[PDB]
Write a protein that binds this DNA or RNA. Sequence first.
RNA 1: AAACUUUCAACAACGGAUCUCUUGGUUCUCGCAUCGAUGAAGAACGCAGCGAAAUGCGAUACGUAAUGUGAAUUGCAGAAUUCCGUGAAUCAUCGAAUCUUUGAACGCACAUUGCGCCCCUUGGUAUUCCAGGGGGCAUGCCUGUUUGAGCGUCAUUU
Length: 126
Amino acid sequence: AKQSLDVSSDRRKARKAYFTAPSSQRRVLLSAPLSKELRAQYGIKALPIRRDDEVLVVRGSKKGQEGKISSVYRLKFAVQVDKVTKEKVNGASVPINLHPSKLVITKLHLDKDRKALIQRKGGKLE
RNA sequence: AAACUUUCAACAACGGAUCUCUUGGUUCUCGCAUCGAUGAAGAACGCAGCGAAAUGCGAUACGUAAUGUGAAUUGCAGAAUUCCGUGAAUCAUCGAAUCUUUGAACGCACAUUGCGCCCCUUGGUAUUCCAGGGGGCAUGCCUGUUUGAGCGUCAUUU
Ligand SMILES: [Mg+2]
Ligand SMILES: [Mg+2]
Ligand SMILES: [Mg+2]
Ligand SMILES: [Mg+2]
Ligand SMILES: [Mg+2]
Ligand SMILES: [Mg+2]
Ligand SMILES: [Mg+2]
Ligand SMILES: [Mg+2]
Ligand SMILES: [Mg+2]
Ligand SMILES: [Mg+2]
Ligand SMILES: [Mg+2]
Ligand SMILES: [Mg+2]
Ligand SMILES: [Mg+2]
Ligand SMILES: [Mg+2]
Ligand SMILES: [Mg+2]
């Protein structure tokens, strides 16, 4: 239950705040949990998702597939992961949009800001 | 007997009801006090690699700076060794700037993209003419400054 008179339980307001979120807010909204191995290694549970992250799909119809995130398509709230495609009938190959909450990060793209982000969230960085 | 006409069903039409949704409205409550001659509200015209609008901006033109975040944007195209970085982004924030023609709108005028005058500077053999660049020139009122006007009026003068 809500205890503060600053946040809203209004469903209409929550949906406007989701669907009209700018990209810097959608980055936090498009978070993805880590794997068992990375959660043991880094001490933290979920991070905002990145391009060069390696992921495993754990839901839907492409579950159990691997790849690198080809694109974080924040305008569609989606991630496009290579090796996860739809073969069209003309021979074209279109990327299937995935949600990061149905993904599991199995290898992070680490740089200085990601390391500081892990340490900020309390992570082991090991 | 058909055709025709009528009724009913199924399927197909016409049409967009019903149901289920909802980034909208409505009403109540709480908190706050902030437009403009330092040029507002409003208007017109423009601005994007491909845009008519909406939204945003002003010839620095869907923006510049600065700061925070930290890798997007994307409908295509392009750029993406910049990506362990004073650093992507139609991102957030926003204290520095720009801000066309206007508009209370302020040289005058305006059904004109009309006509002046002043200063500095530049070019044309130029203080005077023509041109370009920059800066000015409204009204009422207040305080002050300077220059004045009035036998309104006081001293001082062979
Ligand atoms: Mg990070
Ligand atoms: Mg009301
Ligand atoms: Mg203006
Ligand atoms: Mg205005
Ligand atoms: Mg209008
Ligand atoms: Mg433009
Ligand atoms: Mg437009
Ligand atoms: Mg600019
Ligand atoms: Mg940007
Ligand atoms: Mg913005
Ligand atoms: Mg300018
Ligand atoms: Mg402006
Ligand atoms: Mg005239
Ligand atoms: Mg005329
Ligand atoms: Mg006066």
